């Protein structure tokens, strides 16, 4: 709870001012555990207080989390997902195909986000990924 | 739509996984720093011990 | 934590000044744990640019300017990892050397070898890190 | 209803073009509802005669030329028959399959067998067609 989260907050505070930049709201939520979309963050970064604010304190954030808790919790449910590239039902997809789905489809990720992700994803010597194991690792928490 | 929703969930989860890894790595470096530092407080051990 | 007596043991000549490169060791003889980075930042934020040595007044003014950061380095009494998540209470000697000599303000392998002298290692190859942190600090 | 992002989900390769035979599925992905006939007429009224693929500009020009007919297909919310005349509110599964697989732009039996999964059928052998039309669209 709040002790691990305070240590996460104290790592996001870099200046040591007690307050983190409002831009780093969606990384702090995600660091604690949650997954939120960057739309959901925009719909709860707005306020009359935090919309006007340049930085946010740990009491403010704890207040935001309490207000939006249900929606915020709803982001942690997803453990199962389905994806094609595999049509033949091998259970495997290439790293090229994974990069194409992540960077070319949906909200779109960057290549740097995908390159970051493939530092904590098993990839065999063929260059393929078991996508059932990959979904389990990403949801793992 | 269902394929697009499955892709958005995948990249939201990936974004939530990445930051946790990046935080975890930062904590590993920060943990090393504060132990390395406490051991080099043993200049004390040379100076009076 | 200023101490004139500690300064008089660094001053071995009775000049009144000590070398600017013994600033980190003087802090860590006083009490204070500052990082090698923190030590460089405190020197760099004074126009001690051309200064070859520091007097006790100069050292006093630096500690008073930086009291808040420097005090923080002597709060900590415990030390968790974040290198066990299973909660086995054990870490491999390989991971323990890697954090020490590859992460942060890197120790040398010879320094790490000194710290693993008389440190028990099982048949898996793992060390009780709680005992190892206590055995390093409580001395 | 043009959408560049929808085009970029049909383009998978990133060539900037999609096959001329994926034109009906792209219009229908967008929001529109054109017949397979209307889709052919839209292609045939341009000298896209020899064209194997379409770019987003070409697709934009066709939708703008045919906006009125294409918009008409997303007006409707209710659907009558003309199969029933008695006004029983019921139609035999035989007549329902016949209108779907034998009239108009024919569905396959496998498409129809999918839509009659979970669809109740009485001892006469008739289905409530109001519930069946609602269950197909309102999903």
Swiss-Prot record, chain B:
Domain annotation IQ: ranges: 3-27, 28-49
Signal peptide: none
Top-level division of the source organism's lineage: Eukaryota
Subcellular location: Golgi apparatus membrane
Tissues expressing this chain: Neuronal and non-neuronal cells of the brain.
Subunit structure: May be a homodimer, which associates with multiple calmodulin or myosin light chains.
Annotated function: Processive actin-based motor that can move in large steps approximating the 36-nm pseudo-repeat of the actin filament. Can hydrolyze ATP in the presence of actin, which is essential for its function as a motor protein. Involved in melanosome transport. Also mediates the transport of vesicles to the plasma membrane. May also be required for some polarization process involved in dendrite formation.
Family: Belongs to the TRAFAC class myosin-kinesin ATPase superfamily. Myosin family.
Name recorded for this polypeptide: Unconventional myosin-Va
UniProt lineage: Eukaryota, Metazoa, Chordata, Craniata, Vertebrata
Curated annotation (Swiss-Prot), chains C, D:
Outcome when changing residue 111 to A: Decreases interaction with SCN8A in the absence of calcium
One Pfam family matching this protein: EF-hand_7
PROSITE patterns linked: EF_HAND_1, EF_HAND_2
GO biological process: autophagosome membrane docking; calcineurin-mediated signaling; cellular response to interferon-beta; cellular response to type II interferon; detection of calcium ion; establishment of protein localization to mitochondrial membrane; G2/M transition of mitotic cell cycle; mitochondrion-endoplasmic reticulum membrane tethering
Modification sites for N6-methyllysine: 106
Posttranslational mods: Ubiquitination results in a strongly decreased activity. Phosphorylation results in a decreased activity.
Positions annotated to bind Ca(2+) 2: 47, 49, 51, 53, 58
Residues bearing PTM Phosphoserine: 72, 92
Superkingdom classification of source: Eukaryota
GO molecular function, one term: calcium-dependent protein binding
Chain positions covered by the region annotation Necessary and sufficient for interaction with PCP4: 67-139
Subcellular location: Cytoplasm, Cytoskeleton, Spindle; Cytoplasm, Cytoskeleton, Spindle pole; Cytoplasm, Cytoskeleton, Microtubule organizing center, Centrosome; Cell projection, Cilium, Flagellum
Modified residues annotated as N6,N6,N6-trimethyllysine in this record: 106
Miscellaneous information on this protein: This protein has four functional calcium-binding sites.
Subunit relationships: Homotetramer. Interacts with CEP97, CCP110, MYO1C, TTN/titin and SRY. Interacts with MYO10. Interacts with RRAD. Interacts with USP6; the interaction is calcium dependent. Interacts with CDK5RAP2. Interacts with SCN5A. Interacts with FCHO1. Interacts with MIP in a 1:2 stoichiometry; the interaction with the cytoplasmic domains from two MIP subunits promotes MIP water channel closure. Interacts with ORAI1; this may play a role in the regulation of ORAI1-mediated calcium transport. Interacts with RYR1. Interacts with MYO5A. Interacts with IQCF1. Interacts with SYT7.
Protein name per the record: Calmodulin-1
Name of the gene: Calm1
């Amino acid at each position: 709870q709040i002790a691990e989260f305070k240590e996460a907050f104290s790592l996001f505070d870099k200046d040591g001012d007690g307050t983190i930049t409002t831009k780093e709201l969606g990384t702090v939520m995600r660091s604690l555990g949650q997954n939120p979309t960057e739309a959901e963050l925009q719909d709860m970064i707005n306020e009359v207080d935090a919309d006007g604010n340049g930085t946010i304190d740990f009491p403010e954030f704890l207040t935001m989390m309490a207000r939006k808790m249900k929606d915020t919790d709803s982001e942690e449910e997803i453990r199962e997902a389905f994806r094609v590239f595999d049509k033949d039902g091998n259970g495997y997809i290439s790293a090229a195909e994974l990069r194409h789905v992540m960077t070319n489809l949906g909200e779109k990720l960057t290549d740097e986000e995908v390159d970051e992700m493939i530092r904590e994803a098993d990839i065999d010597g063929d260059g393929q990924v078991n996508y059932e194991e990959f979904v389990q690792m990403m949801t793992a928490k | 739509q269902c394929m697009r929703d499955a892709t958005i969930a995948l990249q939201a989860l990936l974004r939530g996984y990445l930051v946790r890894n990046k935080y975890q790595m930062m904590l590993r470096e920060h943990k090393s720093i504060i132990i390395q530092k406490h051991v080099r407080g043993w200049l004390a051990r040379v100076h009076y011990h």
